[PDB]
Amino acid sequence: LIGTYRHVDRATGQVLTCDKCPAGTYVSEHCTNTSLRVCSSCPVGTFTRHENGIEKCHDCSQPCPWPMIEKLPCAALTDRECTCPPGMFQSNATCAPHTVCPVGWGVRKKGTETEDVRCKQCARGTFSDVPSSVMKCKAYTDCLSQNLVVIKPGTKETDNVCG
């Protein structure tokens, strides 16, 4: 199942086909004609992403620069991965809070760790009564569908009042 790699045995010069070691480990001892290769777990701070025949694991990258945080840790199988925290997006070599769409506007495109929120003015029939970087405009309460009349029209900031 697991792959193999060729190794020149030091003592004999024999070219051997040894078993690769699984990701998360490295070869602490190559095979010989009479012994299986031995694998060991990557020490803290290092990793290997695939089956390998290497003698040392790779060092993880440096700690994330604040305000960036880890979305993946430095672990036996993975190098740490950094990202702007939720509510922020990667901007000019750093992190910036997402745009807050004001009342009368709503989120058109959700903000991510690399792209800012996209706001749009609430379309007729919808409203947003709170400042927010996540909420979309909401549809008016349907008066008719409640056998009521609109006693007070809504705006892009407020729901219509039914009665």
Swiss-Prot record:
Oxidized in response to reactive oxygen species (ROS), leading to endocytosis. Disulfide bonds join C18-C31, C21-C39, C42-C57, C60-C74, C64-C82, C84-C95, C101-C119, C122-C137, C143-C162. It is found in: Cell membrane. TNFR-Cys repeats lie at residues 1-39, 41-82, 84-118, 121-162. Changing N33Q: Abolishes one glycosylation site and reduces total N-glycosylation. Detected in fetal spinal cord and in brain neurons, with higher levels in brain from Alzheimer disease patients (at protein level). Highly expressed in heart, brain, placenta, pancreas, lymph node, thymus and prostate. Detected at lower levels in lung, skeletal muscle, kidney, testis, uterus, small intestine, colon, spleen, bone marrow and fetal liver. Very low levels were found in adult liver and peripheral blood leukocytes. Induction: Up-regulated by TNF. Glycans are attached at N33, N92. It comes from the Eukaryota. Associates with TRADD. Interacts with NGFR. Interacts with CASP8. (Microbial infection) Interacts with hepatitis C virus (HCV) non-structural protein 5A; this interaction allows the modulation by the virus of JNK, p38 MAPK, STAT3, and Akt signaling pathways in a DR6-dependent manner. Promotes apoptosis, possibly via a pathway that involves the activation of NF-kappa-B. Can also promote apoptosis mediated by BAX and by the release of cytochrome c from the mitochondria into the cytoplasm. Trophic-factor deprivation triggers the cleavage of surface APP by beta-secretase to release sAPP-beta which is further cleaved to release an N-terminal fragment of APP (N-APP). Negatively regulates oligodendrocyte survival, maturation and myelination. This is Tumor necrosis factor receptor superfamily member 21. It comes from Homo sapiens (Human). The chain holds residues 50 to 212 of 655 of the full protein.
